Design a protein around this ligand. Structure first.
Ligand SMILES: N[C@H](CCC(=O)N[C@@H](CS)C(=O)NCC(=O)O)C(=O)O
Ligand SMILES: N[C@H](CCC(=O)N[C@@H](CS)C(=O)NCC(=O)O)C(=O)O
Ligand SMILES: C=C(CC)C(=O)c1ccc(OCC(=O)O)c(Cl)c1Cl
Ligand SMILES: C=C(CC)C(=O)c1ccc(OCC(=O)O)c(Cl)c1Cl
Ligand SMILES: [Ca+2]
Ligand SMILES: [Ca+2]
Ligand SMILES: [Ca+2]
Ligand SMILES: [Ca+2]
Ligand SMILES: [Ca+2]
Ligand SMILES: [Ca+2]
Lengths: 208, 209
């Protein structure tokens, strides 16, 4: 029984929402506003004093990747053996690092920094193209035969990079087909077109 | 195995995974990459994300220090008792990861202007681990469940390098303070923590700590 407590923004919940939609799960969205947040109660009672906070039945979770690995573990989205498990984690950590650099740019330094960042970008996208080239021609998923929680996080990451810098995936045939093929999965396709996704901004400060 | 840790000559992001191996009774080879070899470009260019640590476990090659930790934690039974505990272990480790980058960021980019703000913010950042200890067996065992987990080794490293940055920062936090000594006192880790292997590396690459 799933509840997502976050700001009215896609951000660090985009990926875990795509995961839930595509696994055909329901969930509730409890929305915290900037005004409510500044009141202090929820931040004070939260583990590390941030959001997302995620309820699953009796269990309360924080940290967006802790949620991904949790859903991935509980819904069978984590490779087939212990080695694919390691390789899933490798991809997701690599996604986390580029997502961090994306956030600092968006939040702290967008205007002066976008040019440098965009220059750097193909260098940062290369490894996921490489990894796809090494896993059955890139025709499948980022790791092994099956969908893993990393796929959802790398999909979100590519989507928001196509908005920040359109055409950045054009030099990368594998990543470029991948984004279209995953988006074409019918439970994701629907969600991705639903108002519950479409009607949120990507970040909180209006930049993208 | 055989395990090989390829990295710079510093504790940095391999301190925790090293402690894990030592305490788990494992041996491994340290392949050292100097700043001068790194600037040549070859190893960088052939590395998945162009960074170190690289870690070989037999035929398997891994990157990303928390990938190493969850891999070792997974394969050596250091990941909690069921799925719920796996989530709590991940929650701890991610929390440890965020304060590690705030640490790294200060060290590397801004240590002089920044140490003062960082140090006042510190207790607020340390409290959650106190809180977590207080809710698991009065704080007397490990950060999650009845058994040691990869998260413990990463949290222990984090507390150590913070006693070096800011001596006495754990005086206000009884559970974390006892935890540091009790984990450091485990016989296979006591030994490693006293060995030249550990003692003769600096914490970071720029001479600050
Ligand atoms: N380590 C991150 C933490 C998330 C984070 O940076 N939270 C932000 C928004 S996504 C926040 O709650 N900031 C408001 C504050 O610090 O009060 C995660 O994966 O969940
Ligand atoms: N996400 C990190 C990446 C490690 C990292 O930030 N590596 C640094 C040194 S600790 C590096 O290889 N920098 C050299 C460079 O950027 O060329 C991990 O957990 O392994
Ligand atoms: C993750 C983020 C953007 C994708 C982020 O860092 C962030 C921080 C503070 C925020 O507002 C709450 C406040 O009053 O500070 C909001 Cl809405 C966001 Cl989205
Ligand atoms: C681990 C680090 C300090 C916590 C770190 O980020 C780092 C970066 C570059 C480095 O040298 C090679 C070079 O590129 O100069 C070295 Cl030795 C380190 Cl340790
Ligand atoms: Ca709903
Ligand atoms: Ca709602
Ligand atoms: Ca599956
Ligand atoms: Ca194209
Ligand atoms: Ca050795
Ligand atoms: Ca065990």
């Amino acid at each position: 029984p799933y509840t997502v407590v976050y700001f009215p923004v896609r951000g660090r919940c985009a990926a875990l929402r795509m995961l839930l939609a595509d696994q055909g799960q329901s969930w509730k969205e409890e929305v915290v506003t900037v005004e409510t947040w500044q009141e202090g109660s929820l931040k004070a009672s939260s583990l590390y004093g941030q959001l997302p906070k995620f309820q699953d039945g009796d269990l309360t979770l924080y940290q967006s990747n802790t949620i991904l690995r949790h859903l991935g573990r509980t819904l069978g989205l984590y490779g087939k053996d212990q080695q694919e498990a390691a390789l899933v984690d490798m991809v997701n950590d690599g996604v986390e690092d580029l997502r961090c650099k994306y956030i600092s740019l968006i939040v702290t330094n967008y205007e002066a920094g976008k040019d440098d960042y965009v220059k750097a970008l193909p260098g940062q996208l290369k490894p996921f193209e490489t990894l796809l080239s090494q896993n059955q021609g890139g025709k499948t998923f980022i790791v092994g035969d099956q969908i893993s929680f990393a796929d959802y996080n790398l999909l979100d990451l590519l989507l928001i990079h196509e908005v920040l810098a359109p055409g950045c995936l054009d030099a990368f045939p594998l990543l470029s087909a991948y984004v279209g093929r995953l988006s074409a999965r019918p439970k994701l396709k629907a969600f991705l077109a639903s108002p519950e996704y479409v009607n949120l901004p990507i970040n909180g400060n209006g930049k993208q």
